[model samples]
Target: DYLLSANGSKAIDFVWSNFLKHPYNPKLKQPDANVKAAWEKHADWEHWSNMGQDWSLNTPSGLVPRPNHGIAHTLRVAQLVPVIAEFLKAYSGDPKFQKLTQKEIQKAQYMMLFSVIGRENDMSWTDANHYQQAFKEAYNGQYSKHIYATFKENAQKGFLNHVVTNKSSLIPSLFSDESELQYWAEALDTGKPGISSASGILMALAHDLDLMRCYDKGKFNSLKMKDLVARLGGNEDAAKKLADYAHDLIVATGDRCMGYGVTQDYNYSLFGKCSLDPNECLKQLQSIPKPETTL
Candidate 1:
């Protein structure tokens, strides 16, 4: 089975249920119960894949413009999670990722998958608040309860700051000794003291997966810097900052970014930079390590 696991990769139920309750998510074109059952009978990833969409065509998710952020884009990232995870496991120089067991590796993958299910809405509503809104919604074991307690916490922390900020700088010990490294990795798994404002390993990976979309076939060359400025709420600073960080990531760890179903070319970007060929990127995302669900 191309499924990461028989049951949501053996780690989660369906975090999308949280979005069903999302106050601002206007995505479903169908009835609510039918949408729930649709996700059940067939994996949401494959269901959206067959629709020939590389980006979200749904009505905007309110807070953020999703010309590229929606179910289609989000699930594409879901499949890419394991590929990135496997690459980090085998080739990452960092001890934090390289040292994980297969089980541990998949543990992270599954958690990230759930992390992204509601990402469009998460970013739209909660991320700006550093997931504080989500915590309140899911508090007392309500919304994020589907995810295991640990992953829920980590995913929430991880989801923070991925947008409009550079994550590598959030935690300084990205490549360091056990104690600092522990903060980077375990901080993703859970968190520590005095640094509640920082991000974690899973979130870092999550950030890369999402940020790398700038290279998507639709956006790579077509959307110039000014175009992206428009997409980024017409904020030139936001576009420039994100673009600068994107260039940094591609130069630094893009090897991992380009692996699996990443990019096929590194042509051009107003900010700096292949999986960047968004069409090529879409082809790879649709084909590489294809999902088991064909229904």
Candidate 2:
């Protein structure tokens, strides 16, 4: 079932539209002009998405771009809490508004967090190891642990509650279960599921975890391409066309460009000095023989 009703969706859309105009960047407040300029340049999603090699270019004093892109993005997502909280207060009691449950609201927030940080895939970190490593690297091992603890403390205190207290904002009467907020905070801090499994339910609801798990386990070869087409309510011809298109896009863009991992080099050639169309890519993908099914 859809968590947000039409009205609720509209409300979120409204907040998101406003949020996008001036995306938050903590680094924007830095005293250094170059750092501030760099962050301001990429504050909006459009600039960030289209950012090419310019991000790696040296700035004044030979300071290259900080490798905290993911962290910066997630922090920007955190800025939307106040906007959504305000929307809830304004629409909570309106009969025209279909309100979300506390759990739904919590899940929605986490979804936004995950989506912006590119963690929507099931293969996104299953534990806190990557998160810890990323934070440590991003901060250059400077008070990263303290910063993380402070983040946990703030979440535990309830992001909404803290915002309301600090900003003199109103909270919707419908959001009565404050404990869920603490549960979320603790889960984020410890990278373990609390009252409910955050990663488990979020990925399950999005229908990605299982598919990714299958891919990771090399089970896709066993899965029939025809079956996949049938599952998508398409015929073999349509599947062929779709696969061809996907492969073509990948070829044109270069597979290396798709690699977003920290260690990945966008310039590195994964398929060296070869041109292949989408049809060829699809054929290669399908060439993997089906695994023997044991009884």
Candidate 3:
């Protein structure tokens, strides 16, 4: 069963409509001239869809896609979390798969869209609080306050943890205790049945698995320093360095959802493929037309 009810779907429509107008970039405080212009320039779902590039040509790290994490990836994630959730429940006998309510999945879907807003795409160290402020201002009140309660926490974790290589002491961080995040990570890493009902993990896995989509292969692959600059902007030595790093990350994640790990019996192509060609994912990037809201 499709998780989005008429009302639930309307809520999504509301978020998408407002998201277009209220472009977000943690680096740009509100609408600075740069953010405004950049947002307008790439304005609309098509320009933003599956660009195969993330960095923007402008200074100020405008509201357009960031150097690494961009709205394109996020919005595409937005489309997927629901599809993944629905598919999991539809075909599974596992109770963990059926654990979350439709509303829970709805919240997770919205959160997946802007999870990376926690850090500016270029800078890994933006204050995490900026994300909450940005989200509150950008999304409308009714849908946001209720669902966004879990948004900041899980989204940040998802952003940080979506790399999803088996974590070990080499990666060192705050580390988990009796909390849920570690369980979620472990479940995904092992490709287990589920994460003890972690809708957060569902959200994280949805986000993590979405990384399977990022490699910019084509005449316009984003990994190439020249193509990186050629497609969007920002081609410093560091940009090239990040490109290489992202390449490694992208290829590593390709196994999720359908490869050996995904093949672990709990995952499949949510839509058609977990990962795809230059034009392969364009269908997903552009499909799922905004549902009518009667708003």
The alpha-carbon RMSD values of the candidates against the true structure, listed in the order shown, are 16.7, 16.5, 18.3
Kindly provide the TM-score of model 1 when superposed on the true structure, using C-alpha atoms.
0.35
Top model by lDDT, which number?
A: 3
Residues 132-220, candidate 3, lDDT per residue (tens digit)?
33344444331223222233443445434433432342132222332433433333311112334546545654444444343223312
Ranking by lDDT: 3, 1, 2
Clashing pairs in 2: 248-278
Q: Which regions of candidate 3 are displaced past 4 Å?
A: 1-64, 122-196, 215-295
Each model's TM-score? Answer: 0.35, 0.29, 0.35
TM-score ranking of the models = 1, 3, 2
| C-alpha RMSD (angstroms) for model 1 | 16.7
Model 2: runs farther than 4 Å from truth? 1-7, 14-21, 24-176, 185-200, 204-295
Candidate 3 or 1, higher lDDT:
3
Candidate 1 on 33-147: residue-level lDDT in tens? 4333433343323332221232322222222122333333334444444544444443334566555555443434443444443332322221223232233333432333322
lDDT of 2 by residue, 60-98 (tens): 222223222222222222223222333323323333223
